[PDB]
Amino acid sequence: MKYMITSKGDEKSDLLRLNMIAGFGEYDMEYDDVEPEIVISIGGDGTFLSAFHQYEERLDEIAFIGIHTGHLGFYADWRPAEADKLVKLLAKGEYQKVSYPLLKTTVKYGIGKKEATYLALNESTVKSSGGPFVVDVVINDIHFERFRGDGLCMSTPSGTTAYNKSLGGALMHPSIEAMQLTEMASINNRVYRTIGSPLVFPKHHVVSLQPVNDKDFQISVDHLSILHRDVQEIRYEVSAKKIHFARFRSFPFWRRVHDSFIED
Amino acid sequence: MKYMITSKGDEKSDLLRLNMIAGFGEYDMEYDDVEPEIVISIGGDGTFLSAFHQYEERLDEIAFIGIHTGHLGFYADWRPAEADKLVKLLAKGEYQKVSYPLLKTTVKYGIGKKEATYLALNESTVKSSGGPFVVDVVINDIHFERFRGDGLCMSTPSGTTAYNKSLGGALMHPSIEAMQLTEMASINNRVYRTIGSPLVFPKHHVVSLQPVNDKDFQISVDHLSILHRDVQEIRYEVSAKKIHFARFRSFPFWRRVHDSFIED
Amino acid sequence: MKYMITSKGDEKSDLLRLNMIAGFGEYDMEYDDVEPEIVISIGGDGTFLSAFHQYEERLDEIAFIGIHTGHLGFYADWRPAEADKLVKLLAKGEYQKVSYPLLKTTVKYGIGKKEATYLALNESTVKSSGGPFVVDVVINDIHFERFRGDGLCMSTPSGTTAYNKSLGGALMHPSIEAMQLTEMASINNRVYRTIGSPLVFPKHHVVSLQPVNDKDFQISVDHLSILHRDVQEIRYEVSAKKIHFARFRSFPFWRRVHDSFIED
Amino acid sequence: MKYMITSKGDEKSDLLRLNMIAGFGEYDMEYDDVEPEIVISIGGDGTFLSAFHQYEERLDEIAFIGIHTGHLGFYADWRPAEADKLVKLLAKGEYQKVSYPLLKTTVKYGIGKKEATYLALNESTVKSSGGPFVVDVVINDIHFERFRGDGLCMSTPSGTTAYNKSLGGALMHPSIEAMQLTEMASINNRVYRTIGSPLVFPKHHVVSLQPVNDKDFQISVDHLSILHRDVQEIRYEVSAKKIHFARFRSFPFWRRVHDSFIED
Ligand SMILES: Nc1ncnc2c1ncn2[C@@H]1O[C@H](CN2CC#Cc3nc4c(N)ncnc4n3[C@@H]3O[C@H](CNC(=O)CC(=O)NCC2)[C@@H](O)[C@H]3O)[C@@H](O)[C@H]1O
Ligand SMILES: Nc1ncnc2c1ncn2[C@@H]1O[C@H](CN2CC#Cc3nc4c(N)ncnc4n3[C@@H]3O[C@H](CNC(=O)CC(=O)NCC2)[C@@H](O)[C@H]3O)[C@@H](O)[C@H]1O
Ligand SMILES: Nc1ncnc2c1ncn2[C@@H]1O[C@H](CN2CC#Cc3nc4c(N)ncnc4n3[C@@H]3O[C@H](CNC(=O)CC(=O)NCC2)[C@@H](O)[C@H]3O)[C@@H](O)[C@H]1O
Ligand SMILES: Nc1ncnc2c1ncn2[C@@H]1O[C@H](CN2CC#Cc3nc4c(N)ncnc4n3[C@@H]3O[C@H](CNC(=O)CC(=O)NCC2)[C@@H](O)[C@H]3O)[C@@H](O)[C@H]1O
DSSP states (O other): OEEEEEEOSSHHHHHHHHHHHHHHTTTTOEEOSSSOSEEEEEESHHHHHHHHHHTGGGGGGOEEEEEESSSOOSSOOOOGGGHHHHHHHHHHOOOEEEEEEEEEEEEEESSSOOEEEEEESSEEEEEESSSOEEEEEEETTEEEEEEEESEEEEEOTTTTTTHHHHTTOOEEOTTSOEEEEEEESOOOSSSOOOOOSOEEEETTOOEEEEESSOOOEEEEETTEEEEEOSEEEEEEEEEEEEEEEEESSOOOHHHHHHHHHTOO | OEEEEEEOSSHHHHHHHHHHHHHHTTTTOEEOSSSOSEEEEEESHHHHHHHHHHTGGGGGGOEEEEEESSSOOSSOOOOGGGHHHHHHHHHHOOOEEEEEEEEEEEEEESSSOOEEEEEESSEEEEEESSSOEEEEEEETTEEEEEEEESEEEEEOTTTTTTHHHHTTOOEEOTTSOEEEEEEESOOOSSSOOOOOSOEEEETTOOEEEEESSOOOEEEEETTEEEEEOSEEEEEEEEEEEEEEEEESSOOOHHHHHHHHHTOO | OEEEEEEOSSHHHHHHHHHHHHHHTTTTOEEOSSSOSEEEEEESHHHHHHHHHHTGGGGGGOEEEEEESSSOOSSOOOOGGGHHHHHHHHHHOOOEEEEEEEEEEEEEESSSOOEEEEEESSEEEEEESSSOEEEEEEETTEEEEEEEESEEEEEOTTTTTTHHHHTTOOEEOTTSOEEEEEEESOOOSSSOOOOOSOEEEETTOOEEEEESSOOOEEEEETTEEEEEOSEEEEEEEEEEEEEEEEESSOOOHHHHHHHHHTOO | OEEEEEEOSSHHHHHHHHHHHHHHTTTTOEEOSSSOSEEEEEESHHHHHHHHHHTGGGGGGOEEEEEESSSOOSSOOOOGGGHHHHHHHHHHOOOEEEEEEEEEEEEEESSSOOEEEEEESSEEEEEESSSOEEEEEEETTEEEEEEEESEEEEEOTTTTTTHHHHTTOOEEOTTSOEEEEEEESOOOSSSOOOOOSOEEEETTOOEEEEESSOOOEEEEETTEEEEEOSEEEEEEEEEEEEEEEEESSOOOHHHHHHHHHTOO
16 A cells, blocks of 8 residues: 655665665555554654654554664564565555554643643653752542652653653553553652652553643653643643554564563 | 441441541431441541451441541541541432452362452462462563572552552552562562562453462452462452442542551 | 841731841941852742852851741751841851762853863753754763753752652762762663663762753753753763752751651 | 682683683793682683672782783783783783672571671662562661662662662762662652662661662672571671772772763
8 A cells, every 4th residue: 555664764674775775666665744544764763753753643554564773672672674575465454454553742831721732652751940859649630749859750651661661660561551650760758758659550541740830841752852831730641542553573572672671 | 228347346437437436327317237228437547457357248228437546547438536427428328439459369279179269459479388489570571580489479459558669669659550579679689680660550461370380379359368278270360349438528539648658 | 247138028927027127237247248258048949049049169167057037948957037046147157067968060152162160059951942852861971871851850869859859860968079960761672772770979979961962952040941052061060059048956857858858 | 929810711711711721831820729829710701700799708918910801801901812911911920809799688687686687798688578678778877868769778888889880879989888779660659759869878888778668679799699587687897808900010009981872
């Protein structure tokens, strides 16, 4: 069917992209970067993340495929030397799709209760713009804790191996429809108390962050960091939307984890 | 219907038990500690754990209710002063049942491949009997890591607020059918490498521990610690069985968590 | 001798300051905020920190005294109700001085090797201005590690109970002339490796941070955060300078720690 | 002068020992395992630890030298292929001694206040024999905290890279005369509170552990684990004694750390 290819932009990835397009020219494959059904990303996890966000409004109609040109990427599970077999297998089709959960972030402002939403494949974080970060943490309309620290991180399953991981979070299998909240350097003395442990939330649970004094927050969705002013609320929930991968061979998540962290 | 009552054994819990039995004598409630349908536990979480294990072969036919006589217990969500309202509400019935996942541990030995299974409500841990603890960690028949340390802990959801928590694990809502593995003081240098992060596993994933040199392990299921010799394998999976609680009012898990750890 | 008094600025602290000045008017005590020998800080730890930095060029000739108007401060070990006894004891003199180590940060730039130094009582941190933070860590001219993460924190002894503490650092007694380095969310996979553990350095050891790609860093000394461009090197060492406290009664550091973190 | 050689016991270490003895036979070097001045350890860190404890009553008259036959040991900073140069350099003498602090553990019992002391080069730990571990932590006769968990670890400087490290402790340079206390899986809820952070103590500070209910503790000094009954107190302090190493070339501690943990 229709397809397109994003590239990291170096000479290695651009050449691999050009050879794959020439390979695809020998089948019933039309290049179309407007409404593709197959998106191929050539580079690292960052390149894959940009591919996902470029097409986040057609997630139900796209299958993603990652090729890593350097060190093994987590979302990129094909090596450059296998690109010929990939073109051939992909042209035939009969591939099986695998779906990973996603995270929805909603930012409500004051003056009109204006509201922006974002979809994350790795995580969504909040920090303070300059001053101290203080926020009230509400779970399903229940006041859970007042958080003082450097920020918070809300991670998808497949994002738990990213940044969640460096903050002490747990790695969880992507078949679990959930989101995980981790703290960044929480203050804990006799006056200030937080839970400490990471928190894993099921679908339909809503985590809401509410400003205590300062209302300016730097919010990061995957790789893009946006400043927001006069914030009234930040809402987190497991998204109804899902990212679909094309799979041509078993590469189990824990094998993926073993290779990226233990030995390869 | 039929019911029974376990007690911590002090004068406070025994008296509360005797008054509740006298209260139950004024309804259509028969005391039967052989085949009850309602098990009431009076004491702390340990007392509740013993109640669960005493009746672990009739989990499908029993609803559990916890009363805490001292500090708030996690499984005991009724205060002593509410025992009259409990007797009355429980006598009427029309209560809603809530189910939490459980963990199954299987220990296979050498010589006959003899095999013992255990059901845990908090967690199941492994340690070495004396010598250094070394074990190969296999996930769904894939060799994941060689673990060197003091031991490992496999936790249920409702167990993540217990001991999992002190080992750095994440707290996860009991609606998530999963198990979480945490490390006890893993060795990590240039020669010895483990994942570090806790691991959360979905239903039907099988974590298997295999002895490397020493084959004697002290295994703990909730509160009981048993020594096993000539161990060939330890298998962990989310159990098919579930513990059922009787609920007469909303006490949300995160409110339970807030009260036990933040403030009350 | 000569003295001055800083205040948090609220009505409580300003009134306490005015009453202490009137109390000091009945002794041989001259108010002089240019060249004092006694600096009294009225407020919290932040107020004390500002008092220290305001007079950091006369540390050898000043003794500091902290009064906390709200929650117990760590550097402020006098309650408001004891201000009369403080004025009286302080007027007599015969007090014993206690000295805490300090940290020296040196920032060398390109183009002229221009160089700025700062003195910290809590800690000095480095972060990236926007982009990813990557730095080579050199200890006494030995390349120790390439650090990838959110930043680093270099703490004094008395600063280890502050921010060092929230990053997993150890609390160390101020009699130990040392500095402690902690990581902020280090990346650790198969390609990127850091030590993980905090590092404690003796006097005369020099920790040097060197930019790898990006050369813009947001550097924070205690409470003030300054952006630096075209940075070539950041050097850390235990300072030759020391902060001196006036002590009128034993308040041991571990008792101070117990009261601020365990119970009071 | 006089010397002796301990060996791991495998064919590699025994042969290396025999060749070094034959090499030493060509100088003014007498073999004497009763009162040596040079102790050479051939094996790993465990072999070195046993060498240290075998001669712990003559620490002031002995210099230690480590050769590692397998993976790089931390106390063994010579490779097997350098044994000839070692024999030659060691025979000449004119070597410089380097001294590391040590830890003293004192166990007082009931009935006669009987008292045993131990010297540790790595660490000394306490655990419970079977039941739950509960202990009151007293610092210089000040009640600091009631600890509930799996145990505690008191580490020397050179021991902080060992086991202290796996418990979250800081790595500190051996020139710092100090000891570091780390927790094993402390319980922390609304009723039970510990400090959490590791604690670093200077010389002359005395940490004392006092039983709360159970008085039986399994105490481990380096590699030997001894059970003690009717314990009244466990006292920790930096020892007056020191271990002396023979050094023939600069191998800085942080280079040693880099090679054992970062890359080699
Ligand atoms: N303190 C932090 N610690 C750990 N991760 C962090 C930290 N801060 C941000 N991140 C992650 O970076 C993503 C953004 N990256 C793009 C990426 C990525 C990614 N995704 C996953 C995943 N799902 N599982 C396992 N490894 C993953 N990596 C790996 O991550 C590395 C890339 N990061 C950087 O070096 C810094 C950066 O920010 N770079 C920009 C591009 C590479 O090895 C890549 O294969 C943020 O979304 C945040 O998750
Ligand atoms: N290092 C450890 N850190 C933390 N927890 C640990 C540790 N070692 C064992 N455990 C837990 O103890 C359970 C066994 N306990 C019985 C209990 C319990 C329990 N269960 C939960 C839960 N699900 N959520 C939240 N708090 C919980 N607590 C609370 O736990 C305390 C009781 N523990 C002890 O003081 C020690 C003990 O072992 N005592 C025996 C009886 C009480 O406040 C109780 O309300 C082991 O199963 C292991 O989970
Ligand atoms: N993620 C962090 N976690 C922990 N501490 C952090 C974090 N980020 C910065 N800091 C510290 O703040 C100091 C700056 N503060 C002034 C302060 C302070 C201070 N110093 C010590 C000490 N030596 N020991 C023990 N508690 C201490 N506190 C206590 O700290 C609290 C004040 N912090 C804030 O709420 C935020 C802030 O930044 N506020 C500005 C004023 C109060 O309870 C105060 O009694 C930075 O220097 C950094 O150390
Ligand atoms: N959970 C734990 N995590 C980490 N360390 C632990 C743990 N439990 C005990 N220890 C240490 O073991 C010493 C006893 N060991 C002998 C040893 C050792 C040693 N000392 C240092 C040091 N000072 N710096 C850096 N690495 C060190 N190692 C390295 O340690 C490894 C040996 N350990 C084991 O595999 C297990 C064991 O116990 N084995 C017996 C012999 C080897 O790579 C060795 O080069 C206990 O004293 C305790 O410190």
